[PDB]
Design a protein around this motif. Structure first.
Motif, mmCIF file in Angstrom:
data_model
loop_
_atom_site.group_PDB
_atom_site.id
_atom_site.type_symbol
_atom_site.label_atom_id
_atom_site.label_comp_id
_atom_site.label_asym_id
_atom_site.label_seq_id
_atom_site.Cartn_x
_atom_site.Cartn_y
_atom_site.Cartn_z
ATOM 1 N N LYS A 137 0.621 -1.437 -0.204
ATOM 2 C CA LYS A 137 0.294 0.251 0.246
ATOM 3 C C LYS A 137 1.162 1.452 -0.193
ATOM 4 O O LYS A 137 0.714 2.466 -1.294
ATOM 5 C CB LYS A 137 -0.619 0.220 1.209
ATOM 6 N N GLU A 138 1.674 1.283 0.861
ATOM 7 C CA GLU A 138 2.484 2.137 1.456
ATOM 8 C C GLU A 138 3.479 2.659 -0.096
ATOM 9 O O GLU A 138 4.027 3.582 -0.261
ATOM 10 C CB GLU A 138 3.431 2.050 2.174
ATOM 11 N N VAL A 139 4.124 1.565 -1.197
ATOM 12 C CA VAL A 139 4.611 1.879 -2.725
ATOM 13 C C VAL A 139 3.888 2.502 -2.973
ATOM 14 O O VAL A 139 3.979 3.164 -4.055
ATOM 15 C CB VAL A 139 4.848 0.582 -2.557
ATOM 16 N N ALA A 140 2.204 1.537 -3.667
ATOM 17 C CA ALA A 140 1.495 1.946 -4.356
ATOM 18 C C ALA A 140 1.242 3.052 -4.019
ATOM 19 O O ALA A 140 0.387 4.093 -5.628
ATOM 20 C CB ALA A 140 -0.145 0.764 -4.244
ATOM 21 N N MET A 141 0.850 3.815 -2.767
ATOM 22 C CA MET A 141 -0.101 4.961 -2.868
ATOM 23 C C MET A 141 1.185 6.429 -3.877
ATOM 24 O O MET A 141 1.265 6.884 -4.624
ATOM 25 C CB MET A 141 0.499 5.701 -1.465
ATOM 26 N N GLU A 142 2.782 5.694 -3.756
ATOM 27 C CA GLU A 142 3.898 6.670 -4.019
ATOM 28 C C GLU A 142 4.026 6.552 -5.595
ATOM 29 O O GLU A 142 4.627 7.015 -6.523
ATOM 30 C CB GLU A 142 5.160 5.737 -3.831
ATOM 31 N N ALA A 143 3.144 4.967 -6.469
ATOM 32 C CA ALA A 143 3.057 4.819 -7.301
ATOM 33 C C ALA A 143 2.468 5.798 -7.888
ATOM 34 O O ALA A 143 2.253 6.560 -9.471
ATOM 35 C CB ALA A 143 3.411 3.229 -8.007
ATOM 36 N N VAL A 144 1.377 5.773 -7.411
ATOM 37 C CA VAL A 144 0.126 6.303 -8.320
ATOM 38 C C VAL A 144 0.244 8.196 -8.153
ATOM 39 O O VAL A 144 0.364 8.640 -9.053
ATOM 40 C CB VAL A 144 -1.377 6.284 -7.094
ATOM 41 N N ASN A 145 0.930 8.877 -7.162
ATOM 42 C CA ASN A 145 1.811 9.964 -7.045
ATOM 43 C C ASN A 145 3.071 9.804 -8.360
ATOM 44 O O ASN A 145 2.543 11.119 -8.800
ATOM 45 C CB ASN A 145 2.528 10.070 -5.707
ATOM 46 N N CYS A 146 3.451 9.212 -8.608
ATOM 47 C CA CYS A 146 4.209 9.049 -9.356
ATOM 48 C C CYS A 146 3.794 9.015 -11.203
ATOM 49 O O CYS A 146 4.537 9.359 -12.392
ATOM 50 C CB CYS A 146 5.372 8.338 -9.770
ATOM 51 N N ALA A 147 2.552 8.612 -11.060
ATOM 52 C CA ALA A 147 2.021 8.303 -12.432
ATOM 53 C C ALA A 147 0.269 8.831 -11.741
ATOM 54 O O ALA A 147 -0.239 7.427 -11.911
ATOM 55 C CB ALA A 147 2.343 7.225 -12.935
ATOM 56 N N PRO A 148 -0.192 9.841 -11.697
ATOM 57 C CA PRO A 148 -1.453 9.666 -11.385
ATOM 58 C C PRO A 148 -2.501 8.805 -13.329
ATOM 59 O O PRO A 148 -3.900 8.585 -12.659
ATOM 60 C CB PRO A 148 -1.982 11.311 -10.920
ATOM 61 N N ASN A 149 -2.057 9.509 -13.596
ATOM 62 C CA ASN A 149 -3.025 9.028 -14.706
ATOM 63 C C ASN A 149 -3.079 7.588 -15.704
ATOM 64 O O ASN A 149 -2.848 7.508 -16.793
ATOM 65 C CB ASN A 149 -3.044 10.273 -16.293
ATOM 66 N N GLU A 150 -2.260 7.037 -14.892
ATOM 67 C CA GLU A 150 -1.849 5.383 -15.645
ATOM 68 C C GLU A 150 -3.206 4.736 -14.565
ATOM 69 O O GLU A 150 -3.420 4.882 -13.728
ATOM 70 C CB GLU A 150 -0.726 4.575 -15.213
ATOM 71 N N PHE A 151 -3.091 3.134 -15.705
ATOM 72 C CA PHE A 151 -4.203 2.372 -15.150
ATOM 73 C C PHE A 151 -3.801 1.773 -13.994
ATOM 74 O O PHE A 151 -4.514 2.052 -12.947
ATOM 75 C CB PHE A 151 -4.579 1.762 -15.949
ATOM 76 N N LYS A 152 -2.958 0.989 -14.356
ATOM 77 C CA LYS A 152 -2.172 -0.212 -13.057
ATOM 78 C C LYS A 152 -2.120 0.414 -12.256
ATOM 79 O O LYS A 152 -2.595 -0.475 -11.019
ATOM 80 C CB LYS A 152 -0.599 -0.555 -13.932
ATOM 81 N N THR A 153 -1.117 1.689 -11.646
ATOM 82 C CA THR A 153 -1.286 2.051 -10.405
ATOM 83 C C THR A 153 -3.003 2.163 -9.526
ATOM 84 O O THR A 153 -2.128 1.745 -8.088
ATOM 85 C CB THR A 153 -0.437 4.295 -9.928
ATOM 86 N N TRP A 154 -3.331 2.810 -10.214
ATOM 87 C CA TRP A 154 -4.772 2.344 -9.595
ATOM 88 C C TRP A 154 -5.176 1.627 -9.058
ATOM 89 O O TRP A 154 -6.046 1.473 -8.051
ATOM 90 C CB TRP A 154 -5.748 3.994 -9.896
ATOM 91 N N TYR A 155 -4.912 0.491 -10.312
ATOM 92 C CA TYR A 155 -5.872 -1.346 -9.871
ATOM 93 C C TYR A 155 -5.316 -1.533 -9.145
ATOM 94 O O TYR A 155 -5.969 -2.186 -8.015
ATOM 95 C CB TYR A 155 -5.062 -1.739 -10.992
ATOM 96 N N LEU A 156 -3.537 -1.722 -9.021
ATOM 97 C CA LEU A 156 -2.975 -1.547 -7.394
ATOM 98 C C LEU A 156 -3.417 -1.536 -5.891
ATOM 99 O O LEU A 156 -3.860 -2.222 -5.351
ATOM 100 C CB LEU A 156 -1.370 -1.868 -7.753
#
Lengths: 632, 80, 75, 589
Positions: free
Chosen positions: A319-338
Motif C-alpha cells: 500500500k505504502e508503495v503503490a501510493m507513491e506509485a500513484v503519486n508518480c503516475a496519477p494518469n496511469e491505470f495500473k497504479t490505481w488498479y494496484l
C-alpha cells in the motif's frame, strides 16, 4: 501435419487476396495483419489462399524451405477437395513489418523464379534486392519483419488470455513459434535481435491497460519477457541486457521483469532497491528530464508493489508503495488498479470505491485481434491425424435472459475493474455496497463531501445487479429441485456468470456438468483453469504452514485431470488448425514440475491413443522437453 | 474574519509535471490539473504544498456594484 | 514564497468548479475543497505555500519503507 | 428548368442506392444525408405535406422514382416511392406508414429546412463551396404550394423546439443549448432574410410563457430586424430585473449560467460589432468569460476586444486561453455511395474542358494557412489582425516576454505562428518581385492564392487588385466571390463613414453607384456559375443584391440587369434572387 490442418479459401478471380491486401496497406495501423499465403495449383485451374502464423521470417531461405514443405505435401498425395492430384504452380507469402509500416512478399514459382518485393503505406511497390544486388539494412528488413512477426505470434495469445485464446478468424493456421526455426533457435534469434529494434519497440504501441506506452512498457518488451519466461533463457537475456545497460540505463527494468520470470526474487529486489535508493541510480542524475524519469520510477514502484501483492504478500508495504506509485503516475491505470486491490485486501471498502472511481479507463484502444483482409464457398478440412470423442459435429441451434447478459461483452479495463466490483460485493453484500456507495456518491437528482460517480462505474453497478439477479435465479431454480427428481449452452453461460461474480466451485461444477453432457472448449478451458487455481491455492497454503497426505492426493488427482483437459483442448485446437497455446504449455508445465516428464508421457500413453500421444508430443511436450534449458 | 472560520486547508503532493501543468494528488484521492506558473518557485516534483482556500466578500460586492453600474450605463447610453 | 491567487467561480456542480484568474488561467477544481457557501460568481482566494517538514517526514518514511522491504526480501 | 440541371449516377445494379442507404443509417450524425432521389440528390423540396411531395413528383415526371428524406430529431429515414411510404430505423429494419404522422412530416420538414439553410450558412467562409457534384439545389424559400414556407417554419417552430439540442451546434459552439443550436440559427436566419418579424414576435411571445429562456431568441430576432433599442431594453430586463427568469426560486447553476453567458455574449458582441465602445464591451465580455470559461465565443470576444483596446499583451494570453474544437466538424454534404457521370448544361460564356492541372509555385500552394478549419481559422485571423498593428519583430517581442513566471504556448498557436511566418514570407516574396517588375504574366490560380494570402494577412485592396487581375485571364468563382465581398466591405465602409466625413456627398454617391453596378455584374456571373452547377440558392448573393435594392428601386435594379444582360438571364436573376425580394421579403420596401 500434411494435407489437413490447412484451411483454404477459394477465389473467383486469381490474385484476389494479394490485390485486396495491396489495397488495404493504408488502413492497417496495428501490430499488423496475419501473414498471407496464396496458392495456385494444378493438374482452368483454381486460386486459393489462407492466413498463417508462426513461420520463420528471419531469412528468406527459411521461407523457401517452408513453401517447399507446403508444396511437397501436395505432391506426395492427391488433394481431397471434398472429392484430385494437385501440385502448386505458384506460392506467395506476405508478411508485415510494423516497426516501419511496410509489407514484404516472397513469391516462389514452379518455373523457379524466387521474387521478393515490398509494398508500403501508399502501395508503392518498391523492389527488394538480395545483399547489395548498403547491405546490413537488407538483413535488417528480414530481421525487423521477423521480430514484428514473432510479436504478432505471441501477443495475440497474450492479449486473449482472458477469453481462452479465442480465434474468430477460422481460415488461419497457427504453428508453435518456438519450434519453427530451421537452423536457428527462434527464441535465441529474438534475444540476439532485441537490442537492434529496442528503440523502435514503442512504435508498436501497447496493451489497452497501458495508457502511456514507454521504452520499457510496450508489446516488444512483453513479447521478450514472455519468451524468456517460457524458455528460461536466463543467461542469454542477462548477457544482452547487461550489454544494453551501458548504452541504455533505463532497461534495467527489463532485467528485473526477467529476474522475476526466471524466479530470482532476491537479486531482482536488490536491483529495484539499487534503482530506487542509490545516488548511483540512473533516476538520480540531473541531466535527464524529470518526467521521463518519473515514468520509469512509476513503473519500478508498480513492479515492486505488484510483487508485494501478488506474491510474498505484505498488504501494508504494498500500500505504502503503490501510493507513491500513484503519486508518480496519477494518469496511469495500473497504479490505481494496484492501489484498489490492496485497498480491497485491507477491507477498505470506502477507500476502494474512491480509488476504483479514480481508475482511469482506456478509451478507443482495442486488444489485438486477427482481422480479415477481404470482406459462402470455403474449404475446412477435417484432420484424421489425432481424433477423440465429440468430433461428431452438430448444429447447436437456439434462455434469452442468459445470453443478453451485458457483462459477458465487457472489455479491457472495465472488465478488470468489474472483477474488483465483484471482489467487494462478495464481502459487503449488495445492499451494504449500496449504502457505502450512497455515502460517498451523488445518488439521484430531481450534498458536498459526496463526489461524482464516473458513470461507467454506474453501468458496472447495473451489470452487477443483473448478474446477481440471474445468478440467484439460477441457484434458486436449481436448489428447488434438490434431487426430488439443463442445457450445455446455459451451463457455459451460468458458469461464466458465477465465474465473474466470484463463485468458483459453482462455476467449475457447472462447467463439469456441461462437460458430462457435451464437449465445450470453454467448459474444458475454465475447468482446467479452476484446477490450476486449486493447485496453486493448495500448494501456497502448504507454503503458509489439508493433511500432507490430503495435499499429496489432491495434487496427484488435480494433475491427473489437468493432463486430460490439456489433451482434449489440444485436440480441439488441432481440429481447428491451431498447433499453439501458451495456456496449455503453462498447464502441463506444473504437472511436469511435480512428476517427471517421462511419467507425464506415460500417463498420457495410458488413457490415450498413439496418434494423440504423438500430437501432444509435438504441440506441447517436445518444447518443454528440449526447447527450454535444463530447468527440469 | 468570518472567512477564516469557513477557510479550507488542504495538503497536496506535486506529481508528474509539465511546463504547463502539474498534477496534484490529495489523500482522499482527488487528482487536480494545476497551472505550474502559480506553484511557488522551488516547487520541483514529489514535493508537498499547502493550499489555503478562503472566500472574499468585499470583492463580491465590489464586482456587484461594478456590474450594476456598467449595465445601468449601457441602458443610459443605448436604448431606453 | 506564499503565492496568493484570486479566482472567480464559474459553472459549479457538486463535483467540479471552474475557477478563473485575472491572468486568464482556468482551473478545474473539486467543490469539496471550496468553502460551503461558495455558490457561483463568488470570489475566492487560494493561498499556496510549500511544506518542508512534511517533505522531510514522508522522505524518511519512504526510506524506512524501502529499507524494510530490502530487509524482508533479498540479502 | 427541365432535364438541364438534373444530373444522375449510372446504376450498376438497379436499386444499388437505397440499400447503401439502409446499411449506412447505422452511422448518421448531425443533420444527416441529403434527400436522395432515384440516384441524384436534392435540396429545397417542400416536405411539409405528402400531397405537396406528390405535386413535386408530378411536375418532375411531367417534364421528363424513390425519394428518401431524413429527420435527426429522431434518427429515422422516410422513403416514398410512386404510394409506398415507409421508414428505415437506425437499426435498419423496415417499417410502414399510415397527429403522429403530421408530426413526422413536420419533423422531416423542419430538419430538411435546417439542412438547406445551414449548408449555406456554415460554408460561408469558403463561399458556399460544394464538394458533391451530383447535388441539385433548390432555393428552399420558393418551393411553397399553399404554404408560405417561412411562415410554416415559424408556425411549425415551437412543436419541434425543445428537441433542438439533438441537432447539435455550429462547430464553434462547444456547449449546445436550447438557445444555441442549428434550429435557432436556422430560425433567426430565415426571419432575417424574410424580414417576417411580426409573425415571429407573436409566436415567440406565445412560447415565452411556457419557456421563458426563449427571450434570448426574441432578442437575436430583434437585432436581425434592425431593432436594437427593443433588444437592449429586453437585455437589461433579463440581466437586471428581479422578475427575470435568471433570478428564480429553483436555480440551476450551470443551465441558467449558460443563458446568462449567452445574454452577456449577445450584449458584448452587439457593443463591439456596432457602436464601437470597447470599454463597456470588455467590461461585459470579462463577466461573460467568467460565466462560460469553457466556451469559445467568450474568449474569442474578449480577445477581439483587447485588439481594439490596442494592447496585444492581453490578447496573446486570452488567445492562448481560448478553447479549440478538436472533434466537431463544419456541416458538409457527404455521399451515401462512394465510387463516368452525367452533366446536363442549362444556360437556355465560361466553360473549360480541362480545369487547372497547371504547375504552381511549391511554396505558394503548400501554405497550410489555407484550408484551416473551425476555431483555428478564427484565431489565426486575430493573429494576422494583431501582426498588422505590431509587425513581426514587435510581435515576437511581445511573444518571447510571456511564452517559452511565463507560461507554455498551447502549440496550436505556435503552429499558427509558423503559418504566419510562411504567409508573410510568401506575401513579401510576391510583392517584391511585383514591384521590381512594375517599372518595365502570372497564372489566374496564382492570383487566387496570393489574393487569399493577402486577405488572410489583412491587406484588402492589395488582394482585390489581384482578384481583379485573375478575373481578366479567365473566370474564377473564388475571385468573383472575394471581389464581391470586397465591394460589400467598401460599401459598408463608405456608408458607415458617411454618417459618423473625409469623403464628400458627390464622391459618396458616385462611389456608391459604381460599387452597386459592380456588385450586380459580379452577382449575375456567380449566380450563372451556380446555375450551370445546378445551384439556384445563395444567401450571400441575395444579401448583395438586396443591398443594391435598398440603394436603388427594385424596378430600377431589374432594368439595369435587363439592359446590360440578356432577357432569359434577367428572367433567371428575377427567379433565383429577385422574385424573392420582390415577394418573399414581405413588402419590406
Amino acid at each position: 501435419l500434411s494435407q489437413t490442418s490447412i484451411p483454404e479459401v477459394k477465389e473467383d478471380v486469381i490474385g484476389y487476396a494479394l490485390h485486396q491486401r495491396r489495397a488495404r496497406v493504408g488502413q492497417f495501423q496495428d501490430l499488423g495483419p496475419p501473414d498471407l499465403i496464396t496458392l495456385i495449383k494444378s493438374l482452368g485451374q483454381i486460386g486459393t489462399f489462407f492466413y498463417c502464423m508462426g513461420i520463420d521470417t528471419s531469412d528468406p531461405t527459411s521461407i523457401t524451405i517452408f513453401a517447399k514443405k507446403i508444396t511437397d505435401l501436395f505432391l506426395d498425395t492427391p488433394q481431397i477437395w471434398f472429392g484430385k492430384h494437385f501440385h502448386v504452380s505458384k506460392i506467395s507469402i506476405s508478411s508485415w513489418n510494423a516497426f516501419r509500416k511496410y509489407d514484404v512478399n516472397i513469391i516462389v514459382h514452379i518455373p523457379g523464379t524466387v521474387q521478393t518485393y515490398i509494398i508500403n503505406s501508399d502501395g508503392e511497390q518498391s523492389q527488394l534486392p538480395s545483399v547489395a544486388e548498403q547491405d546490413l539494412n537488407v538483413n535488417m528488413i528480414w530481421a525487423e519483419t521477423f521480430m514484428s512477426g514473432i510479436v504478432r505470434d505471441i501477443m495475440i495469445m497474450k492479449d486473449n488470455r482472458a477469453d481462452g485464446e479465442s480465434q474468430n478468424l477460422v481460415e488461419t493456421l497457427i504453428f508453435n513459434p518456438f519450434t519453427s526455426g530451421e537452423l536457428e533457435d527462434v527464441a535465441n534469434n529474438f534475444i540476439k535481435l532485441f537490442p537492434l529494434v529496442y528503440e523502435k519497440g514503442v512504435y508498436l504501441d501497447a496493451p489497452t491497460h497501458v495508457l502511456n506506452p514507454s521504452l520499457t512498457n510496450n508489446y516488444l518488451v512483453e513479447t521478450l519477457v514472455e519468451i524468456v519466461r517460457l524458455t528460461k533463457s536466463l543467461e542469454a537475456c542477462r548477457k544482452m541486457l547487461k550489454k544494453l545497460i551501458e548504452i541504455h540505463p533505463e532497461a534495467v527494468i527489463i532485467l528485473i521483469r526477467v529476474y522475476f520470470a526466471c524466479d530470482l526474487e532476491i537479486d531482482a529486489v536488490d536491483l529495484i532497491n539499487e534503482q530506487l535508493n542509490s545516488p548511483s541510480s540512473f533516476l538520480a542524475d540531473d541531466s535527464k528530464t524529470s518526467h521521463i524519469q518519473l515514468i520509469f520510477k512509476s513503473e519500478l514502484l508498480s513492479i515492486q508493489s505488484e510483487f508485494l501483492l501478488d506474491v510474498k504478500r505484505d498488504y501494508k508495504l504494498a500500500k505504502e508503495v503503490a501510493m507513491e506509485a500513484v503519486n508518480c503516475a496519477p494518469n496511469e491505470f495500473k497504479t490505481w488498479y494496484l492501489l484498489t486491490r490492496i485497498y480491497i485486501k485491507l477491507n477498505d471498502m470506502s477507500n476502494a470505491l474512491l480509488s476504483l472511481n479514480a481508475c482511469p479507463m482506456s478509451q478507443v484502444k482495442e486488444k489485438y485481434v486477427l482481422r480479415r483482409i477481404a470482406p459462402e464457398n470455403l474449404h475446412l478440412p477435417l484432420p484424421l491425424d489425432a481424433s477423440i470423442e465429440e468430433i461428431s459435429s452438430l448444429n447447436p441451434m437456439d434462455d434469452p435472459n442468459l445470453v443478453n447478459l451485458s457483462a459477458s461483452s465487457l472489455k479491457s479495463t472495465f472488465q478488470l475493474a468489474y472483477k474488483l466490483l465483484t471482489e467487494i460485493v462478495q464481502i459487503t453484500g449488495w445492499e451494504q455496497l449500496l449504502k457505502y456507495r450512497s455515502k460517498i456518491f451523488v445518488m439521484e437528482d430531481e450534498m458536498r463531501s459526496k463526489r461524482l460517480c464516473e458513470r461507467w462505474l454506474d453501468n458496472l453497478f447495473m451489470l452487477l445487479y443483473e448478474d446477481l439477479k440471474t445468478y440467484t435465479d439460477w441457484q434458486s431454480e436449481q436448489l428447488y429441485f434438490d434431487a426430488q427428481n439443463k442445457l450445455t449452452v446455459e451451463w457455459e453461460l451460468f458458469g461464466l456468470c458465477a465465474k465473474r461474480l466470484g463463485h468458483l466451485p459453482e462455476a467449475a461444477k457447472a462447467f463439469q456438468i456441461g462437460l458430462s453432457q457435451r464437449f465445450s472448449p470453454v467448459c474444458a478451458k475454465n475447468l482446467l483453469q479452476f484446477y490450476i487455481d486449486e493447485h496453486k491455492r493448495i500448494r501456497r497454503d502448504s507454503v503458509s504452514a489439508l493433511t500432507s497426505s490430503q495435499i499429496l492426493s489432491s495434487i496427484n488427482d488435480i494433475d491427473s485431470s489437468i493432463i486430460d483437459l490439456v489433451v482434449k483442448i489440444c485436440c480441439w485446437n488441432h481440429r481447428w488448425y491451431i498447433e499453439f497455446s501458451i495456456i496449455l504449455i503453462d498447464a502441463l508445465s506444473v504437472a511436469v514440475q511435480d512428476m517427471g516428464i517421462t511419467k507425464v508421457h506415460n500417463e498420457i500413453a495410458s488413457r490415450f491413443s498413439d496418434p494423440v500421444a504423438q500430437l501432444i508430443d509435438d504441440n506441447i511436450l517436445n518444447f518443454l522437453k528440449n526447447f527450454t534449458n535444463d530447468t527440469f | 474574519d468570518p472567512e477564516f472560520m469557513s477557510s479550507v486547508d488542504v495538503l497536496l503532493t506535486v506529481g508528474k509535471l509539465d511546463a504547463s501543468l502539474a498534477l496534484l494528488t490529495t489523500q482522499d484521492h482527488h487528482v487536480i490539473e494545476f497551472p505550474t506558473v502559480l506553484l511557488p518557485e522551488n516547487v520541483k516534483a514529489g514535493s508537498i504544498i499547502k493550499m489555503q482556500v478562503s472566500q472574499n466578500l468585499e470583492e463580491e460586492k465590489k464586482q456587484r456594484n461594478h456590474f450594476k453600474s456598467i449595465q445601468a450605463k449601457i441602458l443610459e447610453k443605448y436604448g431606453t
